[PDB]
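Supplementary material to the annual report.
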Amino acid sequence: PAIPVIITAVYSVVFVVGLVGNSLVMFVIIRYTKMKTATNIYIFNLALADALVTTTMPFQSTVYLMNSWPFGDVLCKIVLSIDYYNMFTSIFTLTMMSVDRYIAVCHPVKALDFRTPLKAKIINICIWLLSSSVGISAIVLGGTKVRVDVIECSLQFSWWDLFMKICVFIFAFVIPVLIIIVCYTLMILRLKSVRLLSGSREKDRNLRRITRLVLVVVAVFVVCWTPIHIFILVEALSHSTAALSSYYFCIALGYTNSSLNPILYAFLDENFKR
Amino acid sequence: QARKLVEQLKMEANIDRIKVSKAAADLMAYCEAHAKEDPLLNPF
Amino acid sequence: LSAEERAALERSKAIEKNLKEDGISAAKDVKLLLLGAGESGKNTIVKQMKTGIVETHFTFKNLHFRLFDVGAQRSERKKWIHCFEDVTAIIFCVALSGYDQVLNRMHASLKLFDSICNNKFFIDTSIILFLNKKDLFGEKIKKSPLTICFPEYTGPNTYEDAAAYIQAQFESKNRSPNKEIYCHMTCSTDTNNIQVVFDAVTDIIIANNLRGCGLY
Amino acid sequence: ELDQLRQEAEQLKNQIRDARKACADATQITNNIDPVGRIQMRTRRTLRGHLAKIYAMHWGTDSRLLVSASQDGKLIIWDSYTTNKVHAIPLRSSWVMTCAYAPSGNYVACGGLDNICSIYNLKTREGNVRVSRELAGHTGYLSCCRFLDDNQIVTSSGDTTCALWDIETGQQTTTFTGHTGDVMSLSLAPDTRLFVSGACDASAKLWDVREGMCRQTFTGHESDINAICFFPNGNAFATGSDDATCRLFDLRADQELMTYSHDNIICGITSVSFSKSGRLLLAGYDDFNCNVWDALKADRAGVLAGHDNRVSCLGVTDDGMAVATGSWDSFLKIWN
Amino acid sequence: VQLVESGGGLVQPGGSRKLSCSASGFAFSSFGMHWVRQAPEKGLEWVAYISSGSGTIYYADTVKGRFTISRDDPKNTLFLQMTSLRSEDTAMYYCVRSIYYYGSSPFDFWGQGTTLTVSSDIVMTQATSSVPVPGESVSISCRSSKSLLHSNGNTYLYWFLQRPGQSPQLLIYRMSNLASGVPDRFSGSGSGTAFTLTISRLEAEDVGVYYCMQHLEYPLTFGAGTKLEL
Ligand SMILES: COCO[C@H]1C[C@@H](C(=O)OC)[C@]2(C)CC[C@H]3C(=O)O[C@H](c4ccoc4)C[C@]3(C)[C@H]2C1=O
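Predicted assembly:
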């Protein structure tokens, strides 16, 4: 039917929106505010990681349209490594923004020490290194296989596939979702009993706006990361039909999260847009 | 009380004043006489 | 680069490192400016915190407060108030006991609170207001409440209403949504007066953190 | 006495005004000097290291070293040629509105809200700059301090009082009184015999140091005078106030000779300084700029726009090579 | 100001000696330190240099690799450890204060030295060895193998005097700039590779040996020594 053209249009829209949003975010943060605040450094890191994730959409679209592998093994290794590496970087930058906001509100005395720009740079460097570990592992372990009569990229080396799938699921979904939920709910609960957001005719609306923005962020993350991990786990625990077609819709949602990251964390900011 | 202020006002008023033209000519003469020595009009 | 110039550059770099370390150490400090009148509006809170300008340093709950007595500056406030544009808060004291005492004590310049609330630098600087001599108010209020202080009262007697009336009157001069005014009652006998300013300072720094996080 | 003295004072003031009016006009007076048009000064140096608002700077005699005072409690002696921190002097008081460089280069002065003018010795043994002669005796804050020589200093304060001190004994030797409002600025004559003093009473008073008395007064302003400076000739001075205007007075004529104001300028003047020849008058404003007026044509010859906060202090080299401005953005820059 | 030397004496060849210097009366942590040797009958010679913060350390090429220089600012003590002592190491050693900023006076103070007896450089030579000479004016020349005028208008020749039984003292730093505690009768002049020291109205207590030292680029090379005697 019209499934492939619809999915390709979804991928193209995700590509265009992600590139435009990331480029605009980078341009505004390098032309203004001089990256003198920790949240600006985190926003720069997230925008860079999301851009490096989203410069992969024609590759996956061409893979689904040509159905085997029209790129070559060098391109396979570099694309797989870049995809995994910047995936982990984006997710960990989400987690560290959540922890930074929790420290900024719930522990304001100690936030005078931990929330320095230099320390933010340190955690950014550790994020880069911890993601580069998985990137190196992917670029050294992955390979192409002919299986049927179709060539395809994978992590071909037992338990050298399922263990990696479980490890990436734990280190990419469960811990970051737990941290987002806990830090934001503690932040809002503490912020209820705070002036400038108290029970008046002009402060409850601002507190409700903040809470709505927080729930938007968490719902976007959960909705756009759940189906891909659920599908890969139900696959790991005759694949050419609409079951195989749903794989790239799950990929489309996973990339849609990277497209919506700078719409949520940058465009919906008071310090931004001015 | 204000007798000191009155005496100071009398002493300040009882001075010699020269016309505006003399003062303006003096400032113009000093500005021309040192125009060549003013670079803003390099070590860095 | 000569040997002397290289050694000079090394000295300059050492000086820069010392400046950065001193600034890092001093960025944790909290600057509060203390203001009021001579009728027990300054000395009681300075004492309970534990020539031209007096410093009152202390460390409360791992926060370095330093209070800024400028009461000896018997001059115009306009030409030195810009030195306090970066302070966390203004601890301003207003005497209740001078509701009938002539000086009137409530009418200092007619605008002792108006000038502080709107002097073009304290447009977002919070004010911690302290109501002075509550015990003498409770033992004194039975003498002409509706008087030269405020001839618009039309209200009840005794402490718990007159004090609230004067507090609301002094908060009514704010005219600022972002700025907040924190009021409290003092007697110069209690020991819980560092937490009143401490919780306030926590509120201002949480608000500043929210503004720096791009959520307000 | 109660009214006769007041009537006599009013009559004397009216007679002084009439004599001033009759001693005016004479042989508007511009002679088509062919003004400089537009001068494009550019930032040659930037001096980072201050972590608070820069309140005052002063140049040295050699036009290569300068001293800057910040609100973080530090004086810094910079080598402006190579952007080197020659000295970093900590201060007991972190609220300083003035700083001075001794013409001999051996001392610096610092003062502010603590009502003390502290001298610091640079060219001494033991390799450290140490405090010597914390001069005290003012009741208000010090707004300015200028060195006469290595032994004599002059300090203007907020208690409507200027003072001449000798540093060897630590005692004030002359008191200048007569201002009604707080005194904000201070400029010394080139011959170190006279000085002008501007106050918040919208009055500038010209004083003789040796005699100790106000030789004359000028009352042509409408708000608090903030800055003052002598012409290099020593026969005129210029000043600025919070009414967004600058005024050039002359010593001998005892009148207001010229006024620099603009319709779009509604911000006060923080610092005023001339150039070497006196043709240029550079003034720092609250609109974050630093305008350069032509002192003989009363037009905005140029604009120095490189600061992201209030331009607070403004100095010019003795040889006219550089103009250094310090603002509240913790950075001071050098223009050429 | 008091820089006191300690250690030395008579040693056997192949041994090690730890010369120490105690500094008092000045801010030791902001001063660069030099070790300068002198032969029992010849001129001065530079040994080692340590800077403030223990950042930049320079050694003499003739003793590089076997000599170590160090300091302790809480204890205010300079140290020079010397291993594999040779026959040329028989000399008497000096600690030298120096400070480097705009208008500073390096090599200003020299300590009272200590004796030790073992049982792309630049040539800096003075064409005169001895001048017999009070009440007159003398002029003493020094020559270099390279021009000492750097592009910033600064010449780097320092004029020192050594009295018979006294530590060396600085007269002039940077080509005719006098020092603290020096009479105005002394003066300097000259240009590239040709420098003159002028003493007008030579009074007594000027008998001794004069040296010219260069600070343009390490290593530090002294002159030969112009001896003035009555
Ligand atoms: C963030 O956006 C990318 O999402 C990943 C999520 C991966 C996941 O969930 O790991 C637990 C997943 C699904 C694992 C299987 C992967 C695969 O076999 O090869 C693809 C490839 C080949 C060359 O370049 C890329 C990538 C792949 C489909 C992965 C993604 O697309």
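The pocket of U99 is lined by residues A 53, 76, 79-80, 83, 87, 153-154, 165, 168-169, 228-229, 232, 251, 254-255 (CB under 6 Å).
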